[PDB]
Design a protein around this ligand. Structure first.
Ligand SMILES: CCCCCCCCO[C@@H]1O[C@H](CO)[C@@H](O)[C@H](O)[C@H]1O
Length: 325
């Protein structure tokens, strides 16, 4: 067990292994930047706020730990460390999570740079999706990059949200994330938000202006009577020609955008398919685009007591094995 020290930070007493030095609040659970003297990395240390206050808090804590422990990929945020000052389950109150300190996020670029950034996003998404996980909130502030332009997917704007989410469809597919990637890509290439909706309905309005109103094939798959009736009352607008929207873009980029920003989620390109697109020819390497181990999400269906979620969480803290540097 490492020696901890205590220090008042964000109006509470943080208690962290001495390897983590010079904690500096970075926002708000609450996060401090620190220097990990064991690894020589700048890291973010997150002290969970009220992790076991309620059954929901407790399940949420356990989810977040489970997810972070699972994610072991260059383009996805992972867990460098997880700790508690508690020496037993009985004393177990606080959970700290340690990750790479990400120095900037994506919040116009050259086509070479966009290729590289979007490649990294897709590589990470191929991984995430292979675990049967859907991000559901990809956006520029959830994409961290360092000074070598190495990108990691992390974790109110609706500008990047797939239309079916905006419509509370449920039954989302993984290509909700691909929609988001198309939106980010478009913006990197143009320097302008693709669908800067002012409110919820406006977001859908802007989306349909670009991609057209649903065709006959998509209409067949819409169970909602209210949705169908509204849609068929709309003035049928065709898909815009993306080649004339993204003026002067690499035609491969335009072709990729067309394959991502398809109204029907079943017809959007997958992350693995997109990595094989010619746009990424200079990065694509089937040998090093790994998939994830299977992720046991069964806990999501469970309604357990605080002390049970806590115990499970304590189990995961105890079993944690740091990554090799
Ligand atoms: C007027 C606005 C209409 C927007 C149409 C969104 C269509 C999204 O695509 C759909 O999404 C679902 C969710 O995974 C699926 O179950 C469907 O098979 C699919 O067609």
């Amino acid at each position: 067990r490492p020696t901890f020290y205590r220090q008042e930070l964000n109006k509470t007493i943080w208690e962290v292994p001495e390897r983590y030095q010079n904690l500096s609040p970075v926002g708000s659970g609450s996060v401090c930047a620190a220097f990990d003297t064991k690894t020589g990395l700048r890291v973010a240390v997150k002290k969970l706020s009220r992790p076991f206050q309620s059954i929901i808090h407790a399940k949420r804590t356990y989810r977040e730990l489970r997810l972070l422990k699972h994610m072991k990929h260059e383009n996805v945020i992972g867990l460098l460390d997880v700790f508690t000052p508690a020496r037993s389950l009985e004393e177990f109150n606080d959970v700290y999570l340690v990750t790479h300190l990400m120095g900037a996020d994506l919040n116009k670029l050259t086509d070479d740079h966009v290729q590289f950034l979007i490649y990294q996003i897709l590589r990470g998404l191929k991984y995430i999706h292979s675990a049967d996980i859907i991000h559901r909130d990809l956006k520029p502030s959830n994409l961290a990059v360092n000074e070598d332009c190495e990108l990691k997917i992390l974790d109110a704007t609706r500008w990047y949200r797939a239309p079916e989410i905006m419509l509370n469809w449920m039954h989302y597919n993984q290509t909700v994330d691909i929609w988001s990637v198309g939106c980010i890509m478009a913006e990197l290439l143009t320097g302008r938000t693709l669908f800067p909706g002012t409110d919820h309905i406006d977001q859908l309005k802007l989306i349909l202006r670009l991609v057209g109103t649903p065709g006959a094939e998509l209409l067949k798959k819409i169970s909602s009577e209210s949705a169908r009736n509204y849609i068929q009352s709309l003035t049928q607008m065709p898909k815009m020609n993306f080649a004339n929207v993204f003026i002067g873009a690499n035609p491969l980029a335009v072709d990729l955008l067309e394959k991502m920003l398809v109204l029907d989620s079943d017809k959007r390109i997958t992350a693995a398919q997109a990595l094989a697109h010619a746009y990424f020819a200079q990065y694509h390497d089937p040998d090093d685009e790994p998939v994830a181990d299977p992720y046991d999400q069964s806990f999501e269906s469970r309604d357990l007591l605080i002390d049970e979620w806590k115990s499970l969480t304590y189990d995961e803290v105890i079993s944690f094995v740091p990554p090799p540097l």
